[PDB]
């Protein structure tokens, strides 16, 4: 089923970037009618500006110059029960760096009931020039190499020790 | 026939209170919209029936002139009870009292008949 996976927090200059905002229902069987809005502030600036509003089927974006001609939808297609509100930036600039907020306006449908939920997903991304490898990846790689080398040295140490012992046992025979 | 328990003959002293006790029993659980109870009086065996109390979503007391305001409901129908009370019974109250109970979903209609006799 759905997985609420956090978005990547490191966009690279001049290339593409998909900002994940995944807000799936607490019960998958219910049928809702979801639309979303995205707000954004550049780094070093203190307000929030709506950039695009996705609706029943079409994506309407505000007339800010920062995101004109370089934003396309990436969430669920043709569902009308969106359950995944993921914006895709093409040709990221140095202005797509700051705090994004993914407002999810879900309207569930029940027997005699129409609930109006609103989960706010906040994504902070920073644009850079070169893809920086994760500290987790680099430290786990060097740790794997260290463990492999330590196991090799332990094995050869025990090997040469038992070899000297076997040679000493054979010398007496 | 529906299981309705009433005394076939009920003998009451003039001036006392007469509880007309009837037991209706059917499967299922009673429904307020669903459960309907009707009580009628007759002065004699062949005499026209006069409805004097009904249950239709609640008790309706028809306040027949012949009873003044002496009729009261005296039963909790959810208990299969639909008894009525006739306060301060008078000689003219002698006659036949009929309880009719129709209970959805039960198709069958219960009927209890009491012959009330007034002593002296």
């Amino acid at each position: 089923g759905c997985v609420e996976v956090d978005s990547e927090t490191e966009a690279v200059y001049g290339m593409t970037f998909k900002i994940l905002c995944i807000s799936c229902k607490r019960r998958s069987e219910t049928n809702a009618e979801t639309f979303t809005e995205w707000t954004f502030r550049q780094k070093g600036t203190e307000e929030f500006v709506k950039i695009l509003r996705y609706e029943n089927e079409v994506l309407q974006l505000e007339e800010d110059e920062r995101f004109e001609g370089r934003v396309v939808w990436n969430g669920s297609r043709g569902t009308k029960d969106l359950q995944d509100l993921s914006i895709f930036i093409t040709n990221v600039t140095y202005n797509h760096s700051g705090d994004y907020e993914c407002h999810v306006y879900r309207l569930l449908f029940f027997e005699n009931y129409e609930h109006n939920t609103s989960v706010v997903k906040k994504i902070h991304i920073e644009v850079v020039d070169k893809a920086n490898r994760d500290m987790a990846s680099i430290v786990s790689e060097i740790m794997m190499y260290v463990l492999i080398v330590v196991l090799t040295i332990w094995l050869v140490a025990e090997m040469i020790y038992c070899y000297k012992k076997i040679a000493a046992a054979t010398e007496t025979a | 026939s529906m299981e309705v328990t009433v005394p076939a003959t009920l003998n009451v002293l003039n001036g006392s209170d007469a509880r007309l006790p009837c037991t209706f029993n059917s499967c299922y659980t009673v429904n307020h919209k669903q459960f309907s109870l009707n009580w009628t009086y007759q002065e004699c065996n062949n005499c026209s029936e006069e409805m004097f109390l009904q249950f239709r979503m609640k008790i309706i007391n028809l306040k027949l002139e012949r009873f003044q305001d002496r009729v009261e409901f005296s039963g909790n129908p959810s208990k299969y009870d639909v008894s009525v009370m006739l306060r301060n019974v008078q000689p003219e109250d002698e006659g036949i009292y009929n309880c009719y109970i129709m209970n959805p979903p039960d198709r069958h209609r219960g009927h209890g008949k009491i012959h009330l006799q007034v002593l002296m």
């Binding site: 089923g1 229902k25 219910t30 669920s76 569902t79 569930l108 027997e111 939920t117 070899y163 | 499967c27």
Partner: protein
């Protein structure tokens, strides 16, 4: 002993008899037994006459005996019949002469058989009054003649001294009460007329001994029933304290208008629609969705809060609210009937953490107690059978043609030719499916014709060679003639008849020894145990007609409580057929689903009485029959230095333990690879690199093992071969990953073989090595019996395909999923028009049916494991034709096909299974020096030192202290009256814990609190009293140590309740602490020796069960990883809900423990089978993942679930049973 020796009953002889009484048993001559051959034949002038008593032990008393033509003995008293008629009187003479007669016996038998035929009418016509009058008259007449022959209450051998006449008396008394002035309960009085069907138990020969043997077996089952009640009660108190009111959770609304409150609603709403308008009610269920406060149990949809309010699920009968309902739910878990629904409901209500409670309850209560009942019934029957056995012991042209026919009948080759023809005809009839082109149909038809012609020619040749007389003298030949007649009748002149040639395959029995064993079982069912199967049939009939008479009035009257269309449900008791089907379904373990409906319509008291009588009685007899059948069946050279060093390294215990730890780590690193692995990317990375570390370590271990053992010693070892295979697969995967250009097809499909990495633990853990050795030793008989079962179910599945091939299609309406009324849209042609007109209709199959023989095998697996059979039985009995809309119970008698299948396939073949498997385990136990085959060596040492505890030796009681008041205390403590007083106090604490319930008064809770306080006070007082008595030697008894422990735990439970009340707030942990007081109850097994023996048997079987549980846990782990790999992302259709799916390791191991008892495996498999839309979606999005499609592989799903069923059968139903049986024998013998 001489023919002249016996003398007719004369007054002169009786005059001597009375004198011997005035002066003051031979089993061979017992009444009813056959007269021994020693006395020879009876002269015709003395038969059916009173004779002098031949037994001198009885000859003193006033008795006499009358002989039947068949040499049976009948004993009567010589007194006048009710002080009226002496034996010399003429009336009593003719009365006895007609009493002792096979004509009269068979008259009564046929009369009560016709009465049993008439009892099943369920709405008899007007004229049955004179039939019942005739039956009552015949009964009164036979009772009258036996009264005239014996005497009512006067005498030693009077009519009443034997109990089987009490029933004949009661039945006529009740019949005449009914005819005369009768009470108001006409139906509950007509129910009492069923004892006419018990009359045959005494009329028919032998049934009177079979029932006596059953009553003897119950006398042994007594102690296991006591322990069953005690264990169900202890686990019911635990389940009560845990889930009191948890089943009452319901996800309630949030936005209430008109100031409407929870209570203001609950007091005013009662209809299910009004309920559904406020609570969740998940789209088609009768009860609201269970909710949860705890994080794991979950989850109610946005806009709904969790609150415990309303009625419990399943009309109110599925709950742990009161102790009675907790006991009923734990009996439901102990008989494992629909226990998967209770599993899922209480887990959703409380949390997925209580899988621990359900594992304990199943793996102790259900399995251990059922295997204890089996072991005790087995021991009882075996000892009874052993005791019985020991105490018992043209014409010339015609002759030329016949010679030539015998010469060409070629015995050494024609028998084999006909066997090959039989097998070919079977494999030719098994090549039939629903969608068949006309060429295929014609091929099948001409093949059937050719085969039936071959068999007819062979039969006529054999007849003319051996002829009509000596030929038909043989059973197989008369059987083949019957079959060839049944096949030739349809040459040019029904398919149930057509499916009868398959029985010819039993001609393999003369060559196939295990098929011969199956024939022997089926024949012992109607032979040596024919009387026992007749008792079973009579009991099933009695219970069926009793259920009918008691509940068929209400069912018809009050259908709406148990159904929404106000029509009869699928399983009712309004007809004799459906009543019998319900009794059969309760013989199988499926009692509760119908007990709920029958309770709803006809009262809990009556339905509980009837269903518990059915369950207990009918299961006991069935169990006895199963046991009887099964038992009866049994009886420079630097390279060499390098090799030595690396061999020492490999054999080093440090290296062995390190490799075991790395195996455990590499196995546990698979549990993290679920759908939530896109999150926790750091753990994802450390796993992606630990994978390479582990692959390298295992490659180095393999190279060390090579250089240390040599290719010979290495590849001559199955464990090393398994390790080599797993490491080679891992190396292929690593090389592909590191080289690239490999993310396609085979590589991605062998990456999931990483689920086999746990298999490296078998070679290391001795507790799994021993179990795997035992199973691998047993596997040849498994193969033989699986082959026999395959051929038998092939017969049944060819029949099933011929009957239900392509008739399961229906016009479901996809919104609610309800068959169209078949008045409109009667066939597929109109269904397609309705599909053009509307959107939500779909001509859909069942996905598990008899469309071909493979699907037939699957449907039969479901019908024979009883988990998923109702959905097939319904559509079968509704089937009409090949392309017609099914009508509601239009066939209604393929229920007979499924009953016959269950009885033969499931019962008999599973009996063959258990028998051959326990027999193979006994052969292995013999071959291995007689020591147990499920324990390692350290476990065997532990087991011997533990069996030492079974000593009956009385130890030195105590040295009494010299101090006077201390010795007074010592005596008052050592008093047996004091001991029994403590026992009764424990029983009073037990009922104090039982009286609790959900929704009790605050005053009641306070009184129970203070009663518990006084109980703990008394217990601690007697403990410190025994201490002041025996300061030094109190702790030298394990039972006294346990008493000290449990009183400490009780006082600290009170103190912890105090400390929580002060500083903490946690209902769950508070409850689990309060669970401590079950210790104060568990002190009852101290005096109950019959319980203390079976508990010692369990303590004996604990190590072997630990090894079997280790193997089962490793198999469950491998299958859980295979699940998380394949069956994640599948559609959530049924049984694969939000909870209990295959998404993560928790959910996968939960579903797998559910399936470990075979429960609900049909529901778990159903969403996987669907593919090829519109049954699924092959390109879904799954937000948060890159995998598309939400349907699983049908083939891999069938293989997964069927292989897990078979494996967890082998391991859990045939090794748990074997361990329990051997260890219980060990316990009870010494």
């Amino acid at each position: 002993p001489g023919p002249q020796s016996f003398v007719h009953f004369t007054k002169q002889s009786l005059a001597l008899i009375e004198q011997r009484i005035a002066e003051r048993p031979s089993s061979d001559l017992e009444a009813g037994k056959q007269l021994p051959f020693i006395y020879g034949d009876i002269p015709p002038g003395m038969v059916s006459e009173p004779l002098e008593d031949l037994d001198p032990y009885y000859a003193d008393k006033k008795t006499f005996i009358v002989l039947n033509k068949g040499k049976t003995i009948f004993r009567f008293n010589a007194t006048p019949a009710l002080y009226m008629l002496s034996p010399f009187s003429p009336l009593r003479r003719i009365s006895i002469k007609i009493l002792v007669h096979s004509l009269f016996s068979m008259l009564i038998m046929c009369t009560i058989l016709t009465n049993c035929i008439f009892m099943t009418m369920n709405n008899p016509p007007d004229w049955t009054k004179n039939v019942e009058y005739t039956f009552t008259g015949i009964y009164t007449f036979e009772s009258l003649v036996k009264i005239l022959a014996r005497g009512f209450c006067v005498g030693e051998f009077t009519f009443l001294r034997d109990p089987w006449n009490w029933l004949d008396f009661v039945v006529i008394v009740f019949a005449y009460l009914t005819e005369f002035v009768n009470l108001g309960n006409v139906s509950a009085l007509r129910t009492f007329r069923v004892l006419r069907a018990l009359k045959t138990i005494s009329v028919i020969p032998g049934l009177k001994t079979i029932v006596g043997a059953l009553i003897q077996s119950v006398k042994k089952l007594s102690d296991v029933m006591i322990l069953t009640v005690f264990c169900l009660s202890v686990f019911a108190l635990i389940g009560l304290q845990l889930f009191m009111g948890n089943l009452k959770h319901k996800c309630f609304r949030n936005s209430l208008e008109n100031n409407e409150t929870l209570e203001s609603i609950m007091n005013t709403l009662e209809s299910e629609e009004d309920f559904r308008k406020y609570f969740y009610y998940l789209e088609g269920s009768k009860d609201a969705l269970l909710c949860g406060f705890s994080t794991d149990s979950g989850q109610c949809p946005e806009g709904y809060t969790c609150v415990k309010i309303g009625r419990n699920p399943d009309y109110g009968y599925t709950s742990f609210d009161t102790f009675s309902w907790a006991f009923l739910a734990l009996f439901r878990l102990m008989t494992q009937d629909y226990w998967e629904n209770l599993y899922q409901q209480t887990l959703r209500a409380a949390g997925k953490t209580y899988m621990i409670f359900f594992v304990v309850v199943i793996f102790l209560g259900s399995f251990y107690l059922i295997n204890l009942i089996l072991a005790v019934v087995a021991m009882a029957y075996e000892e009874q059978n052993q005791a019985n056995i020991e105490e018992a012991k043209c014409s010339p042209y015609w002759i030329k043609f016949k010679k030539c026919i015998y010469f060409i009948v070629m015995d050494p080759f024609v028998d084999l030719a006909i066997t090959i023809c039989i097998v070919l005809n079977t494999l030719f009839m098994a090549m039939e499916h629903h969608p068949m082109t006309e060429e295929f149909k014609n091929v099948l038809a001409i093949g059937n014709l050719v085969f039936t012609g071959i068999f007819a020619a062979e039969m006529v040749l054999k007849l003319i060679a051996m002829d009509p007389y000596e030929y038909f003298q043989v059973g197989w030949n008369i059987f083949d003639s019957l079959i060839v007649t049944l096949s030739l009748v349809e040459l040019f002149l029904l398919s149930v008849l057509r499916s009868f040639r398959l029985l010819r395959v039993f001609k393999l029995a003369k060559s196939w020894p295990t098929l011969n064993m199956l024939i022997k079982i089926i024949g012992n069912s109607v032979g040596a145990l024919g009387n026992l199967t007749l008792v079973l049939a009579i009991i099933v009939f009695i219970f069926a007609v009793v259920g009918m008479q008691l509940f068929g009035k209400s069912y018809k009257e009050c259908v709406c409580k148990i159904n929404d269309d106000c029509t009869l449900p699928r399983w009712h008791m309004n007809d004799f057929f459906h009543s019998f089907l319900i009794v059969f379904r309760v013989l199988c373990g499926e009692w509760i689903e119908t007990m709920w409906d029958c309770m709803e319509v006809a009262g809990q008291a009556m339905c509980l009485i009837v269903y518990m009588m059915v369950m207990v009685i009918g299961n006991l007899v069935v169990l006895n029959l199963f046991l009887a059948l099964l038992l009866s069946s049994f009886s420079g050279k630097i390279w060499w230095n390098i090799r030595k060093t690396c061999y020492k390294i490999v054999e080093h215990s440090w290296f062995e333990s390190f490799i075991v730890l790395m195996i455990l780590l590499s196995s546990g690193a698979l549990a993290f690879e679920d759908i939530y692995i896109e999150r926790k990317k750091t753990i994802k990375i450390i796993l992606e690199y630990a994978d390479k570390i582990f692959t390298y370590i295992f490659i180095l271990e393999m190279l060390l093992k090579w250089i240390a053992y040599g290719y010979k010693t290495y590849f001559t070892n199955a464990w090393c071969w398994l390790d080599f295979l797993i490491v080679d697969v891992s190396l292929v995967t690593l090389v592909a990953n590191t080289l690239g250009y490999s993310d396609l097809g085979p590589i991605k499909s062998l990456r999931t073989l990483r689920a086999l990495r746990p298999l490296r633990a078998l070679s290391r853990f001795e507790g799994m090595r021993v179990v795997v050795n035992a199973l691998i030793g047993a596997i040849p008989s498994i193969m033989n019996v699986l082959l026999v079962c395959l051929i038998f179910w092939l017969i049944f599945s060819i029949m099933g395909v011929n009957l239900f091939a392509g008739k399961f299609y229906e016009c479901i309406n996809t919104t609610d999923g309800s068959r169209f009324p078949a008045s409109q849209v009667p066939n597929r042609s109109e269904c397609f028009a309705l599909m053009n007109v509307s959107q939500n209709v779909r001509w859909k199959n069942l996905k598990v049916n008899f469309d071909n023989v493979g699907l037939g095998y699957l449907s039969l697996l479901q019908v024979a494991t009883f988990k998923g059979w109702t959905i097939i039985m319904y559509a079968a009995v509704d089937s009409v034709n090949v392309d017609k809309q099914p009508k509601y119970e239009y066939s209604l008698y393929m229920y007979i096909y499924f009953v016959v299948f269950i009885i033969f396939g499931s019962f008999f073949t599973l009996n063959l299974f258990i028998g051959v498997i326990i027999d193979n385990f006994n052969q292995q136990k013999k071959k291995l020096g007689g020591q147990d085959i499920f324990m390692t060596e350290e476990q065997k040492k532990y087991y011997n030192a533990m069996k030492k505890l079974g000593s009956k030796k009385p130890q030195k009681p105590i040295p009494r202290p010299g101090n006077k008041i201390q010795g007074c205390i010592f005596d008052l403590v050592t008093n047996q009256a004091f001991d029994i007083s403590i026992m009764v106090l424990i029983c009073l604490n037990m009922v104090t814990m039982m009286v609790e319930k959900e929704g009790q008064s605050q005053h009641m809770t306070e009184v129970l609190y203070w009663i518990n306080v006084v109980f703990i006070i008394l217990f601690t007082g007697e403990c410190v009293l025994k201490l002041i008595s025996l300061r030094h030697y109190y702790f030298t008894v394990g039972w006294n140590i346990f008493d000290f422990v449990v009183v400490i735990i009780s006082i600290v439970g009170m103190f912890l309740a105090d400390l929580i009340e002060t500083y903490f707030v946690s209902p769950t942990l508070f409850r689990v602490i309060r669970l401590a007081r079950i210790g104060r109850i568990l002190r009852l097994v101290k005096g109950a020796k019959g319980i203390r023996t079976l508990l010692f048997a369990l303590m004996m079987s604990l190590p072997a069960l630990f090894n079997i549980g280790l193997l089962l846990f490793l198999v469950m782990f491998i299958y859980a990883i295979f699940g998380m790999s394949n069956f994640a992302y599948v559609k959530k259709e049924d049984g694969i809900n939000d909870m209990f799916n295959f998404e993560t390791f928790g959910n996968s191991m939960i579903c797998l423990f559910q399936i470990t008892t075979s429960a609900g495996w049909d529901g778990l498999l159903a969403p996987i089978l669907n593919s090829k839309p519109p049954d699924c979606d092959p390109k879904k999005v799954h937000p948060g993942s890159s995998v598309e499609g939400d349907c699983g592989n049908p083939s891999v799903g069938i293989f997964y679930f069927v292989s897990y069923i078979i494996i967890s059968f082998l391991v859990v139903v045939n090794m748990y049973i074997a361990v329990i049986l051997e260890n219980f024998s060990v316990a009870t013998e010494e």
